[PDB]
From a paper:
When the tryptophan concentration is high transcription attenuation occurs as TRAP, binding to the leader RNA region of the trpEDCFBA operon transcript, induces the formation of a transcription terminator hairpin thus preventing the establishment of an antiterminator structure.
Such a switch could be engineered by simply removing the C-terminal amino acids starting from position 72. We tested this idea using B. stearothermophilus TRAP which normally forms 11-mers. The conformation of individual subunits is also very similar, with the main chain r.m.s. difference with the B. halodrurans TRAP (residues 8–65) of 0.38 Å and 0.33 Å, respectively, for the engineered B. stearothermophilus and B. subtilis TRAP. We questioned whether the 12-subunit assemblies of B. halodurans TRAP and B. stearothermophilus E71stop TRAP predominate in solution or whether these were selected from a mixture of different oligomeric states during crystallization.
Numbering used by the authors:
A (entry chain C), B (entry chain A), C (entry chain B), D (entry chain C), E (entry chain A), F (entry chain B), ...: 7 to 71
The structure:
Amino acid sequence: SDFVVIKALEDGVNVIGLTRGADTRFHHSEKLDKGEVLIAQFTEHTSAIKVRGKAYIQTRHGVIE
Amino acid sequence: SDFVVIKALEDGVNVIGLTRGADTRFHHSEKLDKGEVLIAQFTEHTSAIKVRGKAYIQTRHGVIE
Amino acid sequence: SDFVVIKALEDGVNVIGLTRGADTRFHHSEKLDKGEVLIAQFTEHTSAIKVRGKAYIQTRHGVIE
Amino acid sequence: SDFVVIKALEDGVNVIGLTRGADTRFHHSEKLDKGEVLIAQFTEHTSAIKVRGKAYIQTRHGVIE
Amino acid sequence: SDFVVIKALEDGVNVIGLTRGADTRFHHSEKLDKGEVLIAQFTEHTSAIKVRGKAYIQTRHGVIE
Amino acid sequence: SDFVVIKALEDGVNVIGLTRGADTRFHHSEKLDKGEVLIAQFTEHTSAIKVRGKAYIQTRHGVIE
Amino acid sequence: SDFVVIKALEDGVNVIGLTRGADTRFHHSEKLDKGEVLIAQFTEHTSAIKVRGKAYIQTRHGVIE
Amino acid sequence: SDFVVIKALEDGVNVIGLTRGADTRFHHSEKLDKGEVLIAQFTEHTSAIKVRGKAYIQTRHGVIE
Amino acid sequence: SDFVVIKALEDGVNVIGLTRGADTRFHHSEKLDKGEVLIAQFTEHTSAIKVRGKAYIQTRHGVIE
Amino acid sequence: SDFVVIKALEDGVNVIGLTRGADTRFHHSEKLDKGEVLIAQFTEHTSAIKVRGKAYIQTRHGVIE
Amino acid sequence: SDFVVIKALEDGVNVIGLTRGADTRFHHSEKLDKGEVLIAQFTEHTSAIKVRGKAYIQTRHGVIE
Amino acid sequence: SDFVVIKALEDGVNVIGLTRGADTRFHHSEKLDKGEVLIAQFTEHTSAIKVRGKAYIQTRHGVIE
Ligand SMILES: N[C@@H](Cc1c[nH]c2ccccc12)C(=O)O
Ligand SMILES: N[C@@H](Cc1c[nH]c2ccccc12)C(=O)O
Ligand SMILES: N[C@@H](Cc1c[nH]c2ccccc12)C(=O)O
Ligand SMILES: N[C@@H](Cc1c[nH]c2ccccc12)C(=O)O
Ligand SMILES: N[C@@H](Cc1c[nH]c2ccccc12)C(=O)O
Ligand SMILES: N[C@@H](Cc1c[nH]c2ccccc12)C(=O)O
Ligand SMILES: N[C@@H](Cc1c[nH]c2ccccc12)C(=O)O
Ligand SMILES: N[C@@H](Cc1c[nH]c2ccccc12)C(=O)O
Ligand SMILES: N[C@@H](Cc1c[nH]c2ccccc12)C(=O)O
Ligand SMILES: N[C@@H](Cc1c[nH]c2ccccc12)C(=O)O
Ligand SMILES: N[C@@H](Cc1c[nH]c2ccccc12)C(=O)O
Ligand SMILES: N[C@@H](Cc1c[nH]c2ccccc12)C(=O)O
């Protein structure tokens, strides 16, 4: 499965997993402080990922700066 | 499954998931504030995605803005 | 499955799904207003997609405008 | 399955599906007026596609102008 | 399955499908007027395609004219 | 399955299918007149193809003339 | 399965595995001192990886520093 | 299955199929006169191909001139 | 399965295999003298590899030193 | 299965097939005259090929002469 | 399965196979004298390979000199 | 399966097959005299290949000499 790389560029960045299925809700919010990184897959339970806060992101489709 | 990357360039960008199957209706609306990102897959339940609001988008076919 | 990216360049763009199978009818018309984007897969129920109105389109085979 | 992209360059363009199987006949004719686009797959029921009228076409093998 | 793109450069171009199997005979003749295009697959029933008339052809191996 | 493209450069070109199996015989001879094109697969019944006469040939391994 | 390469650029770097499944908790924290490298897969039990501390990271999508 | 392209550059070229299996013998010799082409697969019954006489050959590994 | 190449640049480089599964602990420590190389796979039993000591490392994602 | 192309540059080039399995012995010797070519697969019965005599050889790894 | 190429650059080079499984031990040491080459796969029984002594090594990830 | 190409550059080159399995012994030594070529697969019975004597070797990972 595909994954995304998220580096926080400030404190309090939020990486949020949305549930896979007919129901869509937030199931987890991971806090990243400045400089911390989360490398997160799409999975059986996560089919969309939301990022709140200033972050540098890499995916297969390129960079978000 | 393929995914799309949506960066909101204004508050209130709406990412709308349309139901897979014989019938087509929206099943989820996810709102993004300016600078927020949604990385969203096509899934068993979502076979089309509509984006309303000023956004920067990446897919396998490149950039749409 | 393949997907197409359609950005409306004017109000009232229509993205129309044609039924997969022996019969061919329109099963859904998605109206896009100017600047809205639809990212739509080919699916069990949709084997052809018609676009009416001024639009910018990306597929695996390139850009249409 | 492969698909083709057809943009009408004049009114009254006709995209015609030919039946898959031992029998070959037209099963559907889709009319495109100037500037309209059809993105159409090969399918269980369609193994050849005929285009009548002035059109710009993209397939995996390139462009017809 | 592979497909071929045939653009007629004169009226009456004939695209001829030859039967798959131990026996070989034509099972279908599709005529194209000048400027018309046929996009045709190899299939369960068609294992060779003959083109008669002045035409521009694309296949996986490139252009034949 | 692989296919070959044969364009006759003179009248009376012969494209001959050889039988797949322990035995090898000619099962079909397709006559091409000048400018005609045959696009022919390897198949359950054809494992070698012989061409007699002046022709332009494309395969996956390049051009023969 | 995909893997990530993490080189600690200071003492006390923490590479944290998050549990695969409906629930998300930290199941392991691997402490890296300066110059140590961890090469870690995504696995049945780990579907997201968090990195705290100054580190140089390689994944399939590029370098993070 | 792989195939080879053989063009005779003189009369009396011989393309010979060797039997697949524990037994190795010639099962077929196809005569090519100057300019004639044989496009021949490896098959259930042919696991080596011998060419006698002046010929131009293409395979996946390049050209023999 | 992927593998990593580790060249020790000093005596006593430690290549440490971490257990695949719900639990994480080291199951093997392999020491390398200066100039020695270990080429090590990810496996049923090893889902993360830790390297301690000055080393030159190659993986699919490039060089880490 | 892979194949090799062997062009003899002298009379009496010997292409020798070695048996697949626990035991290794030659099971077939095919002789080539100057200019003759053998295109030979690896097979159920042949897992190594020895060439004796001056020859030009192509394989997936390039040219050996 | 992947393989590695090891050329000894001095006498007494040691290529050592480590056992696949929960248990890790040396199961074989192959001695290479100057200029000798071992081409060795990863296998059911070998999931890590250790090289002692001055050697030139090629793997899919590049060269160790 | 992968294969290697070995050209002897002197008389008495030895290409030695090592047994696949828990045990490792030499099961075959193929002597090559100067200029002879052996093209040898990895197989059910051979999981490592040793070369003694001056030789030119090609594998998927490049050339050894
Ligand atoms: N529960 C939704 C989540 C989702 C994925 N992609 C989306 C795009 C738009 C809206 C919601 C989604 C699903 O699995 O389909
Ligand atoms: N329910 C439709 C949604 C859809 C996907 N692609 C489309 C293209 C056009 C219109 C609707 C659609 C389907 O699954 O097929
Ligand atoms: N119902 C048709 C729709 C279609 C797909 N491709 C086409 C091309 C031409 C005409 C119709 C079509 C089918 O599934 O086959
Ligand atoms: N019914 C035919 C349609 C067709 C496909 N490709 C063709 C080429 C030539 C003529 C007819 C065809 C088939 O499925 O085989
Ligand atoms: N009936 C033949 C048609 C054919 C395909 N390729 C050919 C090449 C030569 C002659 C005939 C053919 C077959 O299926 O095999
Ligand atoms: N009947 C033969 C035809 C053939 C294919 N490739 C060949 C090469 C040489 C001679 C004959 C052949 C076969 O199926 O194997
Ligand atoms: N338990 C979650 C962990 C996870 C993976 N990717 C994520 C993205 C965001 C939040 C949590 C996650 C899962 O397996 O799905
Ligand atoms: N009957 C042999 C033919 C063959 C293929 N490749 C070869 C190489 C050398 C000698 C004989 C062969 C086989 O199937 O294995
Ligand atoms: N036992 C863990 C080991 C592991 C792999 N990748 C990791 C990343 C972070 C922490 C631990 C790990 C697992 O198999 O999942
Ligand atoms: N009978 C041996 C032949 C062989 C293949 N590759 C080799 C390399 C070295 C020595 C012998 C071989 C086998 O099938 O395994
Ligand atoms: N027995 C171990 C050997 C091993 C492979 N890769 C490793 C990395 C580090 C330590 C040991 C290993 C295993 O199969 O998993
Ligand atoms: N019998 C061993 C042979 C072997 C393969 N690769 C090796 C590397 C090192 C030592 C021995 C080997 C095996 O099949 O695994």
